[PDB]
Structure 1
């Protein structure tokens, strides 16, 4: 059964980018929307939309392609249900010598590792994007 919806979302985005799709859709959740907002702010994706039919909620993401290649080149799930990963403020990972982002869930909300270091807090390392 499905036991990691965040990993499902990341895999959907990865496969859509590899297949050169324009948009990608999934069932929605607040955590997924929070991650997508960080991606949009950092500029890896273009637009985030949430639609509601009744109790169902759908998340739609518009993908970006610059030159020939997709903008999101690498996206890796770091923390997983079988192995949770927590880091302090001094040991937050850096992706590609600061050229990528690490998505971190902290007590002040989801941010990048750069913002987490600026705020001087740690948290759970969700994913690496580059």
Structure 2
């Protein structure tokens, strides 16, 4: 059965980018919306939309291509249900020597490793994006 919805969302985005689609849709959740918002703010994707029929919620993401290659060249799930990963404020991972972003869930919300170091807090490491 399906036991990692965040990993499912990242896999959907990766496969859509590799197949060169324009948009990708999935069942929605607040955590997924929060991660997509960070991606859009950092500029890896264009638009994030949420629709509600009666109780089902659909999340739609518009993808970006620059030159011929996709903008997201690498997206990796770090924390997984079989192994949770927690880091202190001084051991936050850096992705591609600062050219990529690590998504971190802290007690002040979801942000990047840069903002987490600026605020001086740690948390859970969700994914690496570059």
Moved over 3 A (4+): none
CA deviation string 1:5-55 (max 9, x = no partner): 000000000000000000000000000000000000000000000000000
Q: Report the secondary structure of 1:97's partner residue.
A: helix
CA distance in 2, matches of 1:39, 1:64: 11
Unmatched 5+ residue regions in structure 2? none
Alignment of 1:81-96 (within 5 A): 81-96=81-96
CA distance in 1, matches of 2:4, 2:60: 19
Match of 1:42 in 2: 42
Q: Report the secondary structure of 2:125's partner residue.
A: strand
Unmatched 5+ residue regions in structure 1? none
TM-score (normalised: structure 1): 1.00
CA distance in 1, matches of 2:128, 2:25: 21
CA deviation string 1:74-94 (max 9, x = no partner): 000000000000000000000
In the comparison of the two structures, how many residue pairs are matched?
130
TM-score (normalised: structure 2): 1.00
Q: Report the secondary structure of 2:92's partner residue.
A: coil
Q: Report the secondary structure of 2:98's partner residue.
A: coil
